[PDB]
């Protein structure tokens, strides 16, 4: 079967400012089949109550989903997205970089 691995971007809704409430986004796109597992991590721990968009897809039929949660960035707290998909031999972790 046609299998396409996900593209992953982790980023904030607004430019990050320490101590200011914001939204942490994990956008996964370009993938097939649609079954996918996405976690947002704070210092390596799963954030609870993450929200996500409803499954939709691009012209080439590949799927995309937005996962997101409110968060207040600080100088020291590390955030990341963890994605698992059949095309991946182990879950992929992408760290939030506030400059990307």
């Amino acid at each position: 079967m046609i299998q396409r691995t996900p593209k992953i971007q982790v980023y904030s809704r607004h430019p990050a400012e320490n101590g200011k409430s914001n939204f942490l986004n994990c956008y996964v796109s370009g993938f097939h089949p649609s079954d996918i597992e996405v976690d947002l991590l704070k210092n390596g721990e799963r954030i609870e109550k993450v929200e996500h968009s409803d499954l939709s897809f691009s012209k080439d039929w590949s799927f995309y989903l937005l996962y997101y949660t409110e968060f207040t960035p600080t100088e020291k707290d590390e955030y990341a997205c963890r994605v698992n998909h059949v095309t991946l031999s182990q879950p992929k972790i992408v760290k939030w970089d506030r400059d990307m």
Partner: protein, 276 residues
Amino acid sequence: GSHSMRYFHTSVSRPGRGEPRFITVGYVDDTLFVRFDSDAASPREEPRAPWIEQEGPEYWDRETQICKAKAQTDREDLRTLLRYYNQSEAGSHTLQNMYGCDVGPDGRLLRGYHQDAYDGKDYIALNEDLSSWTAADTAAQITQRKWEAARVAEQLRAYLEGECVEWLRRYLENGKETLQRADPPKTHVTHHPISDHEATLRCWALGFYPAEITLTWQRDGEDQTQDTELVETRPAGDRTFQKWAAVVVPSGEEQRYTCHVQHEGLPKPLTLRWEP
């Protein structure tokens, strides 16, 4: 400007785990405005934009009836596709469908769409004439023969030329405060040293709507397509989008590079430089 309405549908079978999951969403341009998920407690089509909330209970009842009928049709069609491809009942498979219309600035039909895919690949598509079909393989040709005998194309053409464009125009009017407003990108150029020898120039576009945008880097007036990392445009989560384009430049040469930004919300294209 010109505008689009699209309905997207995905059914995913899951043998041993009940009936297929069915999810459909509707968009006008890049604005999500309705959704239905079969795994919701007591599933109904739900509004996702404020200008659709004013439709009356008859609207939501008819939409929900349609979503449920489409889910049921998909459930049977997934079983049919097992037969057409000689596949086992034990695996998960995917059926996707998109349809909808584009209208021009005068509100007239520019193009209609209706296409289906199985397991991520083209299955059958209504051609742009809205009268003939492109079947991807000998399985889809069976569907094409059935849909030709049933004059399906003529029926889709009547919807796409009629109701599709008439309701899209109604939505554009009722949601004009947002659907007919372009939000231009907020832009800046950032500088990130990579070493003593070079540094990244990243050209940002934030907060823009609709998603269509062009970011290009130039060195002394010539495009840097070769050297440009362009990310895929991505949703901010508040209806707007983000994108950036980056180039690695020799340190001290930053003033040779300009970022060119074109977007429907801007008066004229922007030319940005790194400003320390």
